Design a protein around this ligand. Sequence first.
Ligand SMILES: COc1cc(/C=C/C(=O)O)ccc1O
Ligand SMILES: COc1cc(/C=C/C(=O)O)ccc1O
Lengths: 177, 177
Amino acid sequence: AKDPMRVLKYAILGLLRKGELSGYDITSYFKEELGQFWSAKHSQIYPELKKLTDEGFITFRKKMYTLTDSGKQELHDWLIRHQPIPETVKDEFMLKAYFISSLSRQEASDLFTDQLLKRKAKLSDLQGSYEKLMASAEPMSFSSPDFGHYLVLTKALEREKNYVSWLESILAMIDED
Amino acid sequence: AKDPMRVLKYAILGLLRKGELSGYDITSYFKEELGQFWSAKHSQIYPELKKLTDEGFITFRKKMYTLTDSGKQELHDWLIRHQPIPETVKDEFMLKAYFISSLSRQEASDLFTDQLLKRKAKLSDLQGSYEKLMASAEPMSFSSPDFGHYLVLTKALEREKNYVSWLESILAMIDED
Ligand SMILES: COc1cc(/C=C/C(=O)O)ccc1O
Ligand SMILES: COc1cc(/C=C/C(=O)O)ccc1O
């Protein structure tokens, strides 16, 4: 069996791509933006940092961490590797939807309406984060330092907007004329 | 520590909601439609079936399995329970996108174009499954026996369409005028 903390490997190497960071800084990215789409069990971060140092991908000199040439190559190879798209992530709400025959029209309406209100609230939160990012002076483009952050935030916004739209469509079918 | 096979519990109870099924039938739903969004390690199915029988949620009389009144209540309580939306599923491609600063414009174009072609192919596959479902005679509605299947398939189609659209948008930014 392999160590579950290995899931943090490329997240850690990537965070270091632009230059040195303290463990505090790294831990901070996980507590903030990076933890929203690549959650860490915070107990795993320092141990994985140690493993990557010991494997020669990261060095340190507070301790300040940087990529080695080996680390840079390790991150580059992973970025450019093509992998099949993975298996669909288990969405428990969608398993419920699959079994909707076990609910009355009203029960189905209440289940879907609960999910819609929750997803609209999440979308409001993402929209806030997006507006915060976009409050920067430099217009957004491929060359912006913040382009990767823009990519993750716009993906999440589109994702939740699409979930909301789908739920509204189903509610209209549950509430057919 | 709890048993990972417990992830199959409500999938199994739900499959039995409309009446008796053989283990072959249950295994078949997992190999086909249900495995596409709620994947089972096929080694876990029979053991979980046994656990649910022994817990009194399912009975058997080939062995043919049915929900007990307890099982029906167990499925009902889960269906109507409201849970917070869970944490975002780790999408490794999106971690790469977050670190796009480590790629040239051409490298970024090639990465995103690979992902787009793969997602368009998956979408073609979902569209085929959708057309197969919709080849039934009875028009689709809340009251259709197939409404739950429609829900999972349309969700998946919308999901992948939205991913494709997002990728196209990013490719156009990578290829700005
Ligand atoms: C709320 O702020 C953020 C959220 C995300 C991603 C969220 C998700 O994929 O669900 C990414 C960057 C952010 O700054
Ligand atoms: C390809 O056929 C199917 C696919 C799905 C779901 C796929 C997913 O969520 O990725 C559901 C029912 C189907 O019949």
